[PDB]
Amino acid sequence: LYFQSGGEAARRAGEAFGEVLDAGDRANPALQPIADENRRFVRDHADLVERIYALAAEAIARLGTADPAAAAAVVAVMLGLLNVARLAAHLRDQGRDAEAEELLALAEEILRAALAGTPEEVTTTARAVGQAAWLAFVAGRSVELALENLRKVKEANLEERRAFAEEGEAASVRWLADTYGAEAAAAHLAAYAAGVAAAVAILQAS
Ligand code: NA
Ligand code: NA
Ligand code: NA
Ligand code: NA
Ligand code: NA
């Protein structure tokens, strides 16, 4: 990672995201279990965290951090691969290491290919990759569904990728409200947006 210029800046940005989301979730008894699980993930899967920062460093190298759209795209890449990594971590914790790699490799292929375009295109693809994994995680942690979803993103044009990201994001809001209640869900989503903004600003200053 150290010969991947940008890895330390990506880490600072991701840690800023994590700190802000942690504080938002930790402030509310309904959301604290999320903050605790997120700390456990980072503690237990340092190798996946570093792999996320490595892909972010590739995004920094290609897009720069000289403007808000590029910075947002790098953050979106990290958050999209993080969603993939949560399912990969489940697979690894359960001894299904090869399937975890297949999942990570396909997500990384799609994200890397998007880096040839504009930041706004990268952000759309990254959001779609994130939902491809998240939707499969909630539906029984199915690597088969995740791979199918990722292949559908791969074969989708930009508008179709955006539409899929929007459907998944809407389903995600619904899941948060169903699980934590609408009131706590709104607080969580606001903290998430603040964490994105924190990470964007760290990248811009890097
Ligand atoms: Na790099
Ligand atoms: Na505690
Ligand atoms: Na964990
Ligand atoms: Na996300
Ligand atoms: Na994303």
Numbering used by the authors: 7 to 212
Can you provide the manuscript's text about this entry?
Here we present rotamer inverted fragment finder–diffusion (Riff-Diff), a hybrid machine learning and atomistic modelling strategy for scaffolding catalytic arrays in de novo proteins. We highlight the general applicability of Riff-Diff by designing enzymes for two mechanistically distinct chemical transformations, the retro-aldol reaction and the Morita–Baylis–Hillman reaction. We show that in both cases, it is possible to generate catalysts that exhibit activities rivalling those optimized by in vitro evolution, along with exquisite stereoselectivity. High-resolution structures of six of the designs revealed near-atomic active site design precision.
Experimental structure determination resulted in a 1.13 Å resolution crystal structure for MBH2, one of the designs displaying the lowest conversion. The structure agrees with the design model, showing an overall backbone Cα RMSD of 0.53 Å. The catalytic sidechains superimpose well with the catalytic geometry except for Trp140, which adopts a flipped conformation (sidechain RMSD 0.54 Å excluding Trp140). This flip widens the entrance channel and abolishes the designed π–π-stacking interactions with the substrate 4. In addition, Arg92 adopted two conformations: one resembling the design model, the other pointing away from the active site. Together, these observations provide a possible reason for the low conversion rates of MBH2.
